[PDB]
Amino acid sequence: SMDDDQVAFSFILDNIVTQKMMAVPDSWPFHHPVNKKFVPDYYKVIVNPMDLETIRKNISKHKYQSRESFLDDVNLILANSVKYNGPESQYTKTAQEIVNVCYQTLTEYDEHLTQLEKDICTAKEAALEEAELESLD
Ligand SMILES: C[C@@H]1COCCN1c1cc(C2(S(C)(=O)=O)CC2)nc(-c2cccc3[nH]ccc23)n1
């Protein structure tokens, strides 16, 4: 089923987040959205915030249908640290390690993720066509 495939795709991604990315030492700065009361200027500087809790929420909503779309948000965590903290900040070195262990684990699971991604896309295109042929009956 496409639902079955979406669940498996999302579970693989969630496991990368919880078992690999969140396990990077000293990764606490990236586990949750920045609290505006704690860092009042954060949202004046960072226009497109992202963090590992938000990624997990997006996974639970099946937002990510591709490896690329998942990695778009993973990379925002790193890019926002470069912007807010600087490219040589220890915060950014930590974010870089989060991104790198993500890549490493996506590589490990690329065959299964690619197959799920393709089959989800095929199924979605077929359901779209059938929905459209139906609406015109
Ligand atoms: C901005 C800074 C560097 O760039 C990445 C995210 N960083 C975070 C994140 C968090 C959160 S939190 C607790 O707001 O949920 C998301 C985890 N807090 C604090 C923080 C809060 C209060 C006093 C502080 N003094 C130094 C850092 C700091 N900095």
Side-chain angles (χ1 to χ4, degrees):
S1 166
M2 180 165 77
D3 281 329
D4 287 344
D5 285 350
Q6 294 255 23
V7 166
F9 191 81
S10 292
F11 262 125
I12 293 161
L13 299 181
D14 194 62
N15 294 339
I16 297 180
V17 179
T18 64
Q19 305 307 115
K20 306 296 185 157
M21 296 168 79
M22 287 180 160
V24 168
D26 305 319
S27 58
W28 63 267
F30 309 107
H31 283 201
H32 300 288
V34 176
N35 183 336
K36 181 183 290 205
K37 290 182 169 176
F38 290 163
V39 191
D41 81 324
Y42 189 76
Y43 294 100
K44 299 179 182 171
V45 179
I46 298 306
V47 177
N48 296 112
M50 187 54 54
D51 64 273
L52 298 175
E53 182 186 354
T54 299
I55 292 180
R56 293 195 72 205
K57 160 186 254 198
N58 289 339
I59 291 169
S60 79
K61 296 181 176 180
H62 301 339
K63 183 205 165 167
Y64 305 117
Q65 315 278 291
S66 65
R67 298 154 292 149
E68 185 179 359
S69 61
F70 172 69
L71 281 169
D72 287 343
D73 278 350
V74 173
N75 269 276
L76 252 189
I77 296 178
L78 172 62
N80 288 341
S81 186
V82 172
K83 195 168 173 13
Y84 194 78
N85 299 305
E88 292 301 308
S89 171
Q90 184 65 37
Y91 285 115
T92 297
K93 297 179 191 311
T94 300
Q96 180 70 246
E97 184 51 45
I98 291 171
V99 171
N100 286 347
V101 310
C102 182
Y103 285 130
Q104 183 175 81
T105 315
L106 288 171
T107 294
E108 180 188 351
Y109 285 105
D110 187 60
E111 178 188 279
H112 198 185
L113 284 166
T114 295
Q115 168 257 313
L116 287 162
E117 175 175 322
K118 293 192 201 154
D119 290 356
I120 290 167
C121 177
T122 296
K124 175 187 210 145
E125 290 178 1
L128 190 56
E129 179 59 30
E130 178 75 329
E132 297 171 344
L133 292 169
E134 181 66 11
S135 212
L136 301 171
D137 186 66

